Paper text:
To gain insight into [name]-mediated drug resistance, we determined the structure of full-length [name] from Mycobacterium smegmatis ([name]), which shares 68% sequence identity with [name] from Mycobacterium tuberculosis (M. tuberculosis). [name] consists of an N-terminal GTPase domain and two HBs. Here, we determined structures of [name], with and without bound GTP, and demonstrated that it mediates membrane fission in vitro. Our results suggested that [name], like other BDLPs, has weak GTPase activity and nucleotide-dependent dimerization in solution, but tends to form nucleotide-independent homotypic interactions on the membrane and cuts the membrane.
We also determined the structure of nucleotide-free [name] at 3.2 Å resolution by molecular replacement using the GTP-bound structure as a search model. An [name] dimer with antiparallel packing of HB2 was found in the asymmetric unit. When purified [name] triple-mutant D333K/D337K/E402K was incubated with liposomes, tethering of vesicles was not altered. However, when the HB2 was deleted, tethering could no longer be observed, suggesting a minor role of the HB2-stacking interface but a requirement of the HB2 in [name] self-assembly.
Residue numbers in the entry: 0 to 63, 69 to 421, 457 to 478, 495 to 594
The structure:
Amino acid sequence: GVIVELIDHTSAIAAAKDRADLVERLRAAKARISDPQIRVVIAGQLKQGKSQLLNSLLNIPVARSTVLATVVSYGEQASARLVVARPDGAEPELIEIPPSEVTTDLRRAPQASGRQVLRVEVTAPSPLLKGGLAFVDTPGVGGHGQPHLSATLGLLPDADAMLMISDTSQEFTEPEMKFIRQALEICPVAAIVATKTDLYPHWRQIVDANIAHLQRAGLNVPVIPASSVLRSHAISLNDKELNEESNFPAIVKFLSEHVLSRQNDRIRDQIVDEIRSAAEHLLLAVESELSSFNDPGERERLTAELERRKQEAQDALQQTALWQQVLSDGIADLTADVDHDLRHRFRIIAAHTEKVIDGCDPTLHWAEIGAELEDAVATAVGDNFVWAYQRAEALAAEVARTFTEAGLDAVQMPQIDYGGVLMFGMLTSFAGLGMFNPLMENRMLRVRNEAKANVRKFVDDVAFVVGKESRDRLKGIQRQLRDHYREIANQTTRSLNESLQAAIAAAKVEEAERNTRVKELERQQNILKQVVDHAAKLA
């Protein structure tokens, strides 16, 4: 549309002036708006009907039972790739894979060569996904041998929305409620889908009750009833009649009005700012040369200024640069603080459990004791992760201000006279739910004491496991932010060095060909300004 033409124009200008850095930047911006990747996470516990919901939604059997996070996005032809982790927070690796593989256990897909597979990304030719919606199927959780529901939080920082699937067999359990509040801390745009309305006749009150609950508990989430079963019948008989009846259109409007529409506005704004910034980088050299022509007596101040801003832009690429110091020290600090937070939470949990143990015959309540512990530990991991996420955002925010405070992105004339692979995946704590089940005054003492001891290592082992991922995660964040600002510093360094020589080369021209040169600089200047002002307000 207008933006494409705008991008098109600007890019053309950047290429004739040999600004290869701006063209690629504009190439990335253009790529962002056609493949927006608007990720919507489909969450919820075991047996609630999530996968059937996704299949009924997209009309395609790509979804499945699943053991690995699966991202479904638009592609004319079916295709699939594995997102494979690299050590020490390095950028994950994409590995194409034949579609026949998605059906079974890529957790240890041979192509992965023993590395941890974070997720699978597959394509599907569903008219629903063309606009840029991408659905993240989550593995089975809440069951024996499965992750806790809070493990789903690891998918949300990179998500734009969440659909919380909760079936209508009974009202919300406490774990569902704690998870919803935690999820909203990271991903505010969310909705509850009350599934299986077709199977349970009293489904109605439960939705209202749950709805009550949220308001009473302060959780702002809309509830959308639905039946995947009716939808499936609907495809078959070509009956719209059933579709209003399935209430699936209600799911789409929320996806349209609260997810797709909200995010599209946000994508256009960042791309217009990208166009404006690129144009202004080009304008700097144009107006610097103009000043050198039209105002010869200020060449000293013009060049002295430009030289200063260039060095500062170059020093910003230094190990010692304040923004990089703040970043490096902040990540190191946050890493230690996050581990400290977790172990504080776990210690509180372990202490409670040990008291519980000394209060009964652990051998007569071991299943319930184990269950409470696994839930408490997994929830603490969730609370720790949310806290860590909030602190990382605050740190990232501080580094941006620090960068900005140095004028390392400023390209106005002096007045005189992440496109890489994301690292999001499931959280990890314990091997699985229901899997911690380890081996008169004397019997009781021996038994009670051993359980606790078993409990404290279990708690310690998880802290160990969680801490490594926390560490590599922060390293990944450090890498992404560093790459971002070194790129900007290089562009700014570049734009300032062109402006400097352009001002020098203009002072060597003679009277005969200055006026000819200026006129074309004003034509050029006017064009960028038209572009800048012209696209600045399509905000």
